[PDB]
Amino acid sequence: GMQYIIGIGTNIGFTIENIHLAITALESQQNIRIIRKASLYSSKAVLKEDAPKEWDIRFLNTAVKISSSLKPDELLVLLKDIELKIGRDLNAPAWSPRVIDLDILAAEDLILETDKLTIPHKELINRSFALAPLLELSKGWHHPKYVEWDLNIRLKELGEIVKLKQTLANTIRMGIVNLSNQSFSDGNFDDNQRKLNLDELIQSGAEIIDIGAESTKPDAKPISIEEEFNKLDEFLEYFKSQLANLIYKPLVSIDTRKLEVMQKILAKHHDIIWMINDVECNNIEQKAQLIAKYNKKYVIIHNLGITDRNQYLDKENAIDNVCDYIEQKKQILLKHGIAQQNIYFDIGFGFGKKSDTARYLLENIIEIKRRLELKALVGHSRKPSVLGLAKDSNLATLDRATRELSRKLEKLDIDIIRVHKI
Ligand SMILES: CC1(C)Nc2nc(N)[nH]c(=O)c2N=C1C(=O)NCCN1CC[C@@H](SC[C@H]2O[C@@H](n3cnc4c(N)ncnc43)[C@H](O)[C@@H]2O)C[C@@H]1C(=O)O
Numbered sequence: 001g002m003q004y005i006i007g008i009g010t011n012i013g014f015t016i017e018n019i020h021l022a023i024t025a026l027e028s029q030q031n032i033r034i035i036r037k038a039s040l041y042s043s044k045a046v047l048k049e050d051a052p053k054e055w056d057i058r059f060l061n062t063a064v065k066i067s068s069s070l071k072p073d074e075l076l077v078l079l080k081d082i083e084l085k086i087g088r089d090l091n092a093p094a095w096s097p098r099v100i101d102l103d104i105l106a107a108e109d110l111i112l113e114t115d116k117l118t119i120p121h122k123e124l125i126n127r128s129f130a131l132a133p134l135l136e137l138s139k140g141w142h143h144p145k146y147v148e149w150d151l152n153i154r155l156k157e158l159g160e161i162v163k164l165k166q167t168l169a170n171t172i173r174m175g176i177v178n179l180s181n182q183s184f185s186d187g188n189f190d191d192n193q194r195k196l197n198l199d200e201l202i203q204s205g206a207e208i209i210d211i212g213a214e215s216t217k218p219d220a221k222p223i224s225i226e227e228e229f230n231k232l233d234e235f236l237e238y239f240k241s242q243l244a245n246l247i248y249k250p251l252v253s254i255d256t257r258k259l260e261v262m263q264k265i266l267a268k269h270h271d272i273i274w275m276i277n278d279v280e281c282n283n284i285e286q287k288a289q290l291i292a293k294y295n296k297k298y299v300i301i302h303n304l305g306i307t308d309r310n311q312y313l314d315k316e317n318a319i320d321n322v323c324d325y326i327e328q329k330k331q332i333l334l335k336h337g338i339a340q341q342n343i344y345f346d347i348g349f350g351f352g353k354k355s356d357t358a359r360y361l362l363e364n365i366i367e368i369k370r371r372l373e374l375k376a377l378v379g380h381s382r383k384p385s386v387l388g389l390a391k392d393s394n395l396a397t398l399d400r401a402t403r404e405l406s407r408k409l410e411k412l413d414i415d416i417i418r419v420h421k422i
Pocket residue numbers: 008009010043044045046047059061076095096101102103104105115116117118119120121122123129
């Protein structure tokens with residue numbers, strides 16, 4: 001059938017989620033095939049000269065190449081219906097922030113000029129955020145009305161665009177933001193290292209950031225609920241101050257084990273939070289009520305709180321042990337009204353597992369995912385057990401092995417990988 005390039009943009013809400021939901025909606029049609037997804041691109045909002053500053057929020061843009069038996073006017077109707085389902089107000093103030101925009105950028109060499117639909121899109125050749133993903137998908141494409149134009153040169157003329165390292169792949173990377181004393185680096189008149197560390201995660205491609213205040217050191221000083229909350233709160237305030245300018249606004253996960261902390265942080269910051277990553281699922285019943293109320297994603301971790309190393313898990317019954325435990329916590333979440341698609345599992349390599357047990361469980365991650373019918377979060381970064389490394393390996397060695405395992409997990413389409421370095 002006929003090939004089309006669909007342009008997709010967003011500048012409000014959970015931006016990568018918005019794009020993905022538009023693409024899933026297309027892919028769910030039996031009369032559409034997705035041929036290829038482009039890279040993600042970041043640009044400043046193109047606005048009228050007198051627009052309120054509140055509308056000046058960075059866009060996330062891409063495009064998809066599809067084949068379909070739908071004719072152009074039928075495709076347009078579908079796109080409008082997808083916009084509605086995602087939550088767009090089709091009659092909102094032009095130029096104002098929007099959860100999604102879908103445009104038919106091109107249809108092979110078709111030239112269609114009607115009041116309701118022009119193809120190629122009239123502004124294709126004036127918008128770097130539409131031309132760049134289009135040319136990535138169709139390298140030799142010429143605009144059928146302007147065949148002489150070298151569109152690669154035109155794109156350079158337009159400029160004003162960043163090709164991100166965030167992607168539309170099945171595996172998304174969760175970059176670690178540790179606010180404990182392990183990362184303390186305040187100077188006389190600055191506390192900005194975590195600011196450079198946030199930028200490094202964003203630039204390097206992290207789609208999600210996981211913010212936690214607990215140290216990972218054995219025998220670290222424990223922290224009050226107030227101190228944990230305050231550290232998260234501060235960071236979140238900072239993030240909110242910068243949202244509109246970031247080249248890419250990451251999904252935000254909060255890494256805490258304490259119900260109190262989850263309550264107070266959600267009450268204050270729910271609209272910027274995508275997920276709660278729970279380090280120890282004690283009091284899952286009341287945590288489930290809070291996750292239901294705020295419609296967030298939640299991670300069940302296999303952390304049974306084992307302090308006696310002799311009691312660590314052996315490989316031979318490890319699959320059953322992890323499944324039984326996660327299954328029971330899943331069923332509690334489901335009985336509290338949480339949608340199963342909002343629940344992820346994490347084997348928890350550093351919690352109560354022998355090294356061979358950790359390796360064996362990672363080797364069987366896909367079977368575990370199928371058995372539990374839950375998406376997987378893998379936290380392998382700097383963990384010598386799953387990396388197959390000596391426990392005193394240096395950081396360069398830990399990070400190298402981490403990156404190599406990351407590539408392998410991405411090829412296996414693991415849902416989320418939690419890492420220190422992308
Ligand atoms: C604010 C602005 C400029 N700032 C940005 N800044 C950055 N950095 N990045 C951005 O992405 C960005 N976006 C921006 C932006 O406004 N976006 C809206 C893009 N789209 C959305 C779909 C249609 S909505 C109106 C009708 O157009 C008619 N129509 C005719 N031809 C077509 C066609 N080929 N495809 C679909 N609809 C078509 C239908 O009948 C529809 O009812 C057209 C509209 C546009 O282009 O004006």
